Write a protein that binds this ligand. Structure first.
Ligand SMILES: Cc1cc(F)cc(C)c1Oc1ccc(C(C)(C)O)cc1-c1cn(C)c(=O)cc1NCC(=O)N1CCOCC1
Ligand SMILES: Cc1cc(F)cc(C)c1Oc1ccc(C(C)(C)O)cc1-c1cn(C)c(=O)cc1NCC(=O)N1CCOCC1
Ligand SMILES: Cc1cc(F)cc(C)c1Oc1ccc(C(C)(C)O)cc1-c1cn(C)c(=O)cc1NCC(=O)N1CCOCC1
Lengths: 107, 107, 107
């Protein structure tokens, strides 16, 4: 099986279905929340919404580039928020699940 | 790629046909007052969805796409009486599907 | 690498950034601009928008089909408009650039 297929049909599907996915399914809406510093501090934004489109529209060079985007999504969240926030536990849980599913990856 | 063939040849052929229109998007059970449709048919399918899936790198391979076309025809034959307009249209389209699927490459 | 991937991430990216891209990012709206003859003279219309959808959705059989589309876009423009017209000077700059990027295509 292709790596990128797996990332779409398996890795991403699992994370998307998951309970805590909703804040990561579209980008952080800085106006709606009142956080003018978000686009200042977070240099390269990223969300599963974006990732899903990239898989569906032939953007990624290799599976290593799609994984990059996942880590950036997580690392972004951890930078901008203080540990033990609500959002951060959510991210942490998703990254747990994410990292499980990478290890099953085709080879 | 056989998937290319299913998009560019098989699906265009079927979509362009006169009988396609009821199979180009889901059956809208609300509009038809068919509240039993979504309870009887458990995997609904249509060319709208199939098209989307080919355009968005969903399928594991050509043979999963063929499964979807079959599910489309057989859902029709499950829900509807034989000899109904809808069922004769489905049969027309399936005949034409089987012709086009024969000249499939082997990759 | 796959050449289609190159056409998406490098060629089309570069052309779409460019200052003169905007009139070529969607079909030439003959009704808006008030050109009844455009669609009689131009038998195969084309634009960077349609090429993009096509790259994003697995439409192209191979990379030479995509390259023809880019060439149709320019020639259509030279056919329909007069020399010295602005749109032609724009397309000419875009074509220049297109041809540079095409000379670093994977093989
Ligand atoms: C504000 C908030 C309250 C809450 F109880 C739970 C969450 C996840 C939450 O965070 C979000 C809620 C909605 C949205 C929308 C739909 C606008 O994209 C985003 C977030 C949010 C998402 N992500 C990925 C973040 O990194 C941060 C988000 N919220 C800003 C935030 O965490 N805070 C606002 C002020 O700083 C402390 C808490
Ligand atoms: C209702 C109907 C009348 C007709 F003269 C021809 C058709 C094809 C027809 O079927 C449909 C018409 C519209 C739509 C829309 C566009 C709303 O999705 C769907 C169908 C239809 C499509 N498919 C694939 C089906 O299996 C069944 C559909 N309609 C309900 C239907 O045919 N019946 C409902 C119960 O009575 C027996 C027949
Ligand atoms: C009309 C016009 C005036 C102008 F000052 C600069 C341009 C590029 C221009 O051309 C277009 C402007 C907008 C649009 C929109 C965005 C609506 O589709 C299209 C064009 C246009 C684009 N392309 C690719 C063409 O080949 C021709 C276009 N316009 C009609 C046109 O250029 N002419 C109309 C008849 O007179 C000679 C010039």
């Amino acid at each position: 099986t292709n790596q990128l297929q797996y990332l779409l049909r398996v890795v991403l599907k699992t994370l998307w279905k998951h309970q805590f996915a909703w804040p990561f399914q579209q980008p952080v809406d800085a106006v709606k929340l009142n956080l003018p510093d978000y686009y200042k501090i977070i240099k390269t934004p990223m969300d599963m919404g974006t990732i899903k489109k990239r898989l569906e529209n032939n953007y990624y060079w290799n599976a290593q580039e799609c994984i990059q985007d996942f880590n950036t999504m997580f690392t972004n969240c951890y930078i901008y928020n203080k540990p033990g926030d609500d959002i951060v536990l959510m991210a942490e849980a998703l990254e747990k699940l994410f990292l499980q599913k990478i290890n099953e990856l085709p080879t």
